[PDB]
Amino acid sequence: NISPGAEPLILNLSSNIYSSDITQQIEVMRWNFFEESGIPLPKIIVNPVKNNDSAIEFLLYQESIYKDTLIDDTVYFEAGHAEISFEFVQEKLSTNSIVYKTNKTNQQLAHLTGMDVYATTNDKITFLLKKLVLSNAKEFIGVQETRYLMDIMERKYNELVKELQRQLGLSKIVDILQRLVEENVSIRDLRTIFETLIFWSTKEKDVVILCEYVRIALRRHILGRYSVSGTLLNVWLIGSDIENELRESIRQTSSGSYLNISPERTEQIIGFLKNIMNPTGNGVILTALDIRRYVKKMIEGSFPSVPVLSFQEVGNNIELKVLGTV
Amino acid sequence: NISPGAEPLILNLSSNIYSSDITQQIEVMRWNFFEESGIPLPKIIVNPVKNNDSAIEFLLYQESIYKDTLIDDTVYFEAGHAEISFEFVQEKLSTNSIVYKTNKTNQQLAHLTGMDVYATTNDKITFLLKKLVLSNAKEFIGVQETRYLMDIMERKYNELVKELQRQLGLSKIVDILQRLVEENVSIRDLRTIFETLIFWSTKEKDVVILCEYVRIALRRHILGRYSVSGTLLNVWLIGSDIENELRESIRQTSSGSYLNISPERTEQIIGFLKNIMNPTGNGVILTALDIRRYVKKMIEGSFPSVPVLSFQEVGNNIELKVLGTVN
Amino acid sequence: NISPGAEPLILNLSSNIYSSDITQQIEVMRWNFFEESGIPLPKIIVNPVKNNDSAIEFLLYQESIYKDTLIDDTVYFEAGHAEISFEFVQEKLSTNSIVYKTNKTNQQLAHLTGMDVYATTNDKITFLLKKLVLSNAKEFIGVQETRYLMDIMERKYNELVKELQRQLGLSKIVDILQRLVEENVSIRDLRTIFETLIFWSTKEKDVVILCEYVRIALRRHILGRYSVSGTLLNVWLIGSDIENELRESIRQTSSGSYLNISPERTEQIIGFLKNIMNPTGNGVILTALDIRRYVKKMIEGSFPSVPVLSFQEVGNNIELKVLGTV
């Protein structure tokens, strides 16, 4: 018979690479993703393909998102605040995500240096899967999933849900939760989010503004991720001249808001930042609340995966180390 | 399966320090906190960590709020109206709370002087826990907890609750109770609070104003905490010039009300008070009702944990001893 | 588990003073208080403290209202219309109440003179308890207690209650009953009070005015308390000049009504009265209805516990003896 709709996630593995234990390991990855992101992923379907070409493929709503061949001669790795190590190879995984590859001979030096390394087939598969999902997180949270987070969360917190439903429309709650996952903020702490929306729902009606109040209320989550050992934050600044120019350039229409700036000046502004920033990263850009969403959307696509915060979200209690200013 | 939301409180203890009796002792601390604050805390979860580094950590809604290592060479203490004693070490526990540490050799002198001292692992844990909770009290009282205080409190006082629900909206009751816990006022006496709100609900609608009438009605609780032996209160004053200047500087917007004053003048005003006040504390600042909330929010962060009262909340019956005035 | 709220009344007694019979005697005091005041007190909790310091303490809604030590060398007494007797010691018990103390050796002369004397532990406790409650009577009558007086009082008088509920709001009935207990008027006769409010509810709406009509209707209770043997009333008068000046000084706002008079003139007015009045008391001050509530609130705190009546509440049938005029 006919199924409800396109299957959400399918993994095709050549039978050379396939194994009977990967299903259980994948079911374990779903929990780690939910506890860190607070996004409940659907059930993953894994199909063995009766070919021995060592190929793999990931399908999102039955469209191919990634296809490649696994080899034993190489190994994938991840590095934190640690220093750069020789012979690394960067490869793009999506328009907004990149992974690091190396020859297996380099394995122990990275492991000894403190880097995390993935070498077995099940590691490589699980690593690629989690990075591909994080890149498409906005696709997994919509009307039917929002309603599921509210059906749970009413077996306890029952009055909090009733009050929220009376103050905001369900279609508005969906837009707020989507803007948070778009920038990797975690939505695990729902009562902080719902309590903050109930309080401001009567005073403000702009969905783009409510988003920033929810971000300020999540201070402990944001600082606990980007700061080092909770005591210091590395920073780059935009400066009063560019901030003033950008603040004045704002425009709006029924479709939304945008900036009236030329492509040349935009590329120049980006070029200044590109020249000042070190390729090692490990830093953040601070800005005023009025321009933050536009500065992020402007920089997006050039040296992506760099966080942009604000002087209100970041508190006065922490220490700031400045590494440059545009 | 999936849990309702982030767990409210988790304590991680290295298995060297862990013991089987601490759960029961923690359950006893919850009662003492409820009777003094009137805030009902959720169930605390304690996890043993199979490491022997003597480390501990507290998680609030799964984010780390404090992490440290316990040692046997030092002891924590608390002092009331008593005099200052030698070799004390101050250490910050949060942006708005500080604790005093000392070497174990000093234990009996403080104990003999009348100070309270905490030395065993269970004491140190329970002491740090209560101080961290008091610092975050505003986080534990919201929409779902307010509704719980009203479901209890209707098995008796049933008509009082019906009248309150008809006069005020639940979201408004939540803002009032939060402003009280923000300044350590106790919310244990709910009928005094509910009776006062039913009386003024028609005459006044500003939530920031209703808060002050509830404070005046709680006179016996406030005086019984800061006065000495119920007979005398130590005081510092703001004076007519600064009060008049501050009263005129008030401004407002849809987000709320604020003061139009320069950072330099603000720092100077604070500097005068910082110079006049003695490091021992044991005193209070009196002010007019119109400026009290702003004076508190202004001084906050510089020499914190100093109470600010008013001439209407404090009665004419008690005696006032003045220890200085800003000019 | 969690109790409804702060316990209304708790008595802490040191084991040196505690006894197994005081509970029954306290339960007897509740009846005497209800018949005289018409206010139904909650159940009193008595806790023994395992110390022998002879100390006692009273807690009102878990806050300490009085704390002291009982001794055998002294005795408390009360005197009516009788003359002043030697060696009395006055001590304040609250902002508005004072008690008289004496050495136990003086016991029989006072007893013989006709004064009432309290000497045993149970007497001293019961005497202090009743005086502390009368001082705080306004705290024991509110929304939940008013509703209780109306649930009783409908097993009979059922139509009277229905008519009252249709004419006045419950929050308005609470303010009227509180103003009566604030000035020691008894609320035992509820049908006289309810019948008077049903009659005036349409003609007058000011809660401060309805209070005076209810006082006039209670003439037999008021005269039966302050007059001597029902035939004569001792009086002090304000006079036409001060009454006229006070009548003109009235002002009002949303919070209520008040007098526009200087502190110096206020202290002078009080000083005149303080000089004319004899320390023995046993008298009353008469005034016009328009100023009575303000004159009481003005004199309050200086030589308190002195009744203030009016020419409408007091009838023309009784004889008046004048002891001075300001």
Side-chain angles (χ1 to χ4, degrees), chain A residues 153 159 188 195 220 317, chain B residues 3-4 95 139 143-145:
Chain A
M153 200 82 188
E159 191 70 19
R188 184 56 170 133
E195 286 271 359
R220 289 192 294 267
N317 181 78
Chain B
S3 67
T95 306
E139 302 282 29
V143 167
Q144 182 70 14
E145 299 78 21

Side-chain angles (χ1 to χ4, degrees), chain C residues 30-66:
Chain C
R30 291 177 66 223
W31 280 62
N32 294 11
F33 188 75
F34 183 76
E35 296 303 330
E36 183 166 30
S37 304
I39 301 171
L41 291 174
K43 296 154 60 179
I44 305 192
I45 299 303
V46 58
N47 291 326
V49 175
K50 211 169 186 71
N51 285 187
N52 296 336
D53 205 22
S54 308
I56 67 163
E57 163 177 57
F58 288 106
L59 308 177
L60 174 63
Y61 295 107
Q62 296 168 351
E63 303 304 331
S64 197
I65 206 76
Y66 176 87

Side-chain angles (χ1 to χ4, degrees), chain B residues 153 159 188 191 195 220, chain C residues 3-4 61 139 143-145:
Chain B
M153 199 82 188
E159 191 70 19
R188 184 56 169 133
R191 66 147 274 189
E195 286 271 359
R220 289 191 294 267
Chain C
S3 66
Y61 295 107
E139 301 282 29
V143 167
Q144 182 70 15
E145 298 78 21

Side-chain angles (χ1 to χ4, degrees), chain B residues 93 148 273:
Chain B
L93 185 69
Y148 178 71
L273 185 58

Side-chain angles (χ1 to χ4, degrees), chain A residues 168-185:
Chain A
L168 282 175
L170 186 139
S171 303
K172 199 158 181 171
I173 299 169
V174 177
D175 195 5
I176 293 156
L177 294 184
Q178 279 186 2
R179 291 169 195 250
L180 269 47
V181 305
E182 274 170 20
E183 304 184 31
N184 305 103
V185 176

